[PDB]
Structure formats: structure tokens, C-alpha cells
Amino acid sequence: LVHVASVEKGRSYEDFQKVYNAIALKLREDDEYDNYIGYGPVLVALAWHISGTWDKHDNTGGSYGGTYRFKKEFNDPSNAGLQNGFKFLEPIHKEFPWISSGDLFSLGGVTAVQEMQGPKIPWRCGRVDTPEDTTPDNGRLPDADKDAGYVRTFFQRLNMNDREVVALMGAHALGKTHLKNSGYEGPWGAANNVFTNEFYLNLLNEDWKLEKNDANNEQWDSKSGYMMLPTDYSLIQDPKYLSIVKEYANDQDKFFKDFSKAFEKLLENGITFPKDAPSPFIFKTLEEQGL
Numbered sequence: 154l155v156h157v158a159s160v161e162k163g164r165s166y167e168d169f170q171k172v173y174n175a176i177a178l179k180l181r182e183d184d185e186y187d188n189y190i191g192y193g194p195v196l197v198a199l200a201w202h203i204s205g206t207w208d209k210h211d212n213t214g215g216s217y218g219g220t221y222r223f224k225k226e227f228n229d230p231s232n233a234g235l236q237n238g239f240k241f242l243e244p245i246h247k248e249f250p251w252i253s254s255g256d257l258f259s260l261g262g263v264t265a266v267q268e269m270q271g272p273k274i275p276w277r278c279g280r281v282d283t284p285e286d287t288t289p290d291n292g293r294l295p296d297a298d299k300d301a302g303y304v305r306t307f308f309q310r311l312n313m314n315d316r317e318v319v320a321l322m323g324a325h326a327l328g329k330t331h332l333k334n335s336g337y338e339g340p341w342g343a344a345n346n347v348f349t350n351e352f353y354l355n356l357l358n359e360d361w362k363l364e365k366n367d368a369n370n371e372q373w374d375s376k377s378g379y380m381m382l383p384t385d386y387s388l389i390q391d392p393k394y395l396s397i398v399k400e401y402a403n404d405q406d407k408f409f410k411d412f413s414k415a416f417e418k419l420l421e422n423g424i425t426f427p428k429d430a431p432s433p434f435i436f437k438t439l440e441e442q443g444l
């Protein structure tokens with residue numbers, strides 16, 4: 154099963170920069186969301202879940218089809234609350250009806266990271282909307298109450314190795330958990346609408362206490378008011394994961410480069426790019442454009 158990237162007819166770099174700018178201007182404008190965190194975090198969370206359904210064994214799921222628009226996938230328990238990022242992006246799709254849904258969902262993620270001061274993420278167009286019966290079943294996204302063995306095995310379904318898994322998890326510097334969504338409650342650190350290596354620093358530097366939350370699930374809580382999921386805590390339990398955690402705590406530039414490659418890879422899994430496809434785009438930030 155092959156999905157071949159097909160560029161939206163007659164569109165080029167500057168067309169997608171416009172779509173970037175509209176997302177970015179709206180990000181600026183809707184700052185009150187989730188007690189003033191803004192929609193940045195939920196946008197990267199949406200891009201990760203629409204990509205996270207991929208199965209490298211048969212190329213089912215993945216970002217290409219844009220299948221999150223169908224009710225079986227948006228009703229996935231693993232996706233509770235993500236309807237807020239979808240709603241955010243509705244005005245944008247309306248303004249640019251020519252872009253595909255998978256292109257827009259993935260670009261929203263890229264846009265969020267860059268505007269939150271993270272690294273440039275190269276992004277490629279050409280995902281094409283596929284029909285409702287291509288929507289993958291629920292249950293492909295990962296559980297939080299597991300250990301490093303689980304985590305390692307999970308991400309291998311996405312063709313990700315140890316380094317990629319630890320870089321990717323650094324996105325938990327952003328936003329927070331919400332009891333009503335997931336059964337976990339609280340943020341991972343203090344600067345949660347700015348992309349930094351804080352997740353790794355907090356993981357190593359705080360005084361974590363294992364507790365049961367108000368939904369009766371176990372999570373790691375610090376005196377600072379931070380939390381870690383068991384899967385997060387895994388990363389300092391496995392000695393291979395811990396070595397890389399130390400690395401990124403110690404070197405944010407290294408973390409930014411590895412996150413950048415890994416996030417692009419996640420959003421492009423399952424997509425075959427023609428030799429003559431355009432080169433990956435690197436979008437300018439609003440700030441870089443004077444907007």
C-alpha cells in the first residue's frame with residue numbers, strides 16, 4: 154500500500170507560507186485558551202496523534218489520508234480534547250480550501266513549534282484526503298501507564314529508535330495533562346508555551362513522588378507542582394533512555410536538531426515522495442517576516 158505525495162495543483166512555497174502565517178496570527182490572537190497557555194501545545198498534540206496511527210507493517214493509518222476528519226477517529230478516546238485544535242484550524246481551512254486535511258493538520262504542528270520558539274521543522278506538502286473507510290480503528294495510540302519496554306516496542310511500530318523516542322517525548326515540555334481528557338492532571342514544567350529542553354531538566358532535577366491522582370491513576374508529582382506520566386518516568390528508568398535524557402538536558406541545541414528530524418519523520422511516515430517532488434519547505438516565522 155503506497156501513498157504517493159501529490160502537490161496541491163499549482164501551489165508552491167509561498168502558498169504554504171500564507172497558510173503558515175494564518176495559523177501563526179491566530180495562535181497570537183487566541184492566547185487565553187487553556188488558562189492562557191494558548192493553542193500551541195494542542196496543535197502539536199493533534200499533529201502527533203494524526204500521524205501516530207501509522208503502522209509500518211502495512212502502511213495503514215498515518216497523516217496522509219487526513220482521516221482524523223471522520224467521526225470514528227475524532228471520537229477515539231485517545232484523542233479526547235483534540236477537537237479544540239480541529240476547531241481552531243477550521244477557520245484556516247475555510248480561508249485556504251485548496252490545502253488537504255493531512256497537510257493542514259501536520260502544518261499546524263510545525264507552525265506551533267516554530268512560533269513557540271522551537272527549531273525550524275522542514276515540512277513537505279502533498280498528503281491527499283482518503284475516504285472514510287480508510288480511517289484506522291481506535292487503539293493505535295500509546296498508553297501512559299506503562300514502562301520503557303512498552304514504550305520501546307510501541308515506537309518501533311513507527312520505525313522510531315531510542316534517540317528518536319527520547320527526542321520526541323521532549324514535546325511534553327508543552328501544555329499539560331487534563332483529568333477530564335486522559336485521567337492525568339498537571340503540567341510537566343513552568344514554561345509550557347515555549348519550546349525548550351525543560352522536560353529533561355525537570356525529569357532529572359526534581360524530587361518526584363509517586364502518587365494516585367483524583368482519577369485513581371498513578372503519576373509522578375514534584376513539590377514544584379509538576380508531574381510525569383509513568384511512560385515519561387520510564388525514560389530515566391531504562392539506562393539507555395537515561396543516557397540520552399542527560400544529553401538533551403545538557404544540550405538544548407542537540408535536542409532541537411534531533412527533535413526537528415524526528416518530528417518531520419513522524420509526520421512523513423507512510424508517505425512516498427517522488428524524486429522530483431519539491432525540496433522540503435522551511436517556513437519563516439512571523440517575527441522573521443515583520444508580521
Ligand code: HEM
Pocket residue numbers: 194195197198201233234295296297298304321322324325327328329330331332333334335336337382384416
Ligand atoms: C508514549 C507516548 C506518549 C504518551 C503515553 C503520551 C501521553 C500524553 C497524555 C496522557 C497527554 C495528556 C492529554 C490531556 O489530558 O489532554 C499528553 C499530552 C501532550 N502530548 Fe503526549 N504522549 C506521548 C507522546 C507524545 C509525543 C510523541 C508528542 C509529540 C511530539 C506528544 C505531545 C504532547 C503534547 C504537546 C501534549 C499537551 C497537549 C495539550 O496541552 O493539550 N506526546 N500526552
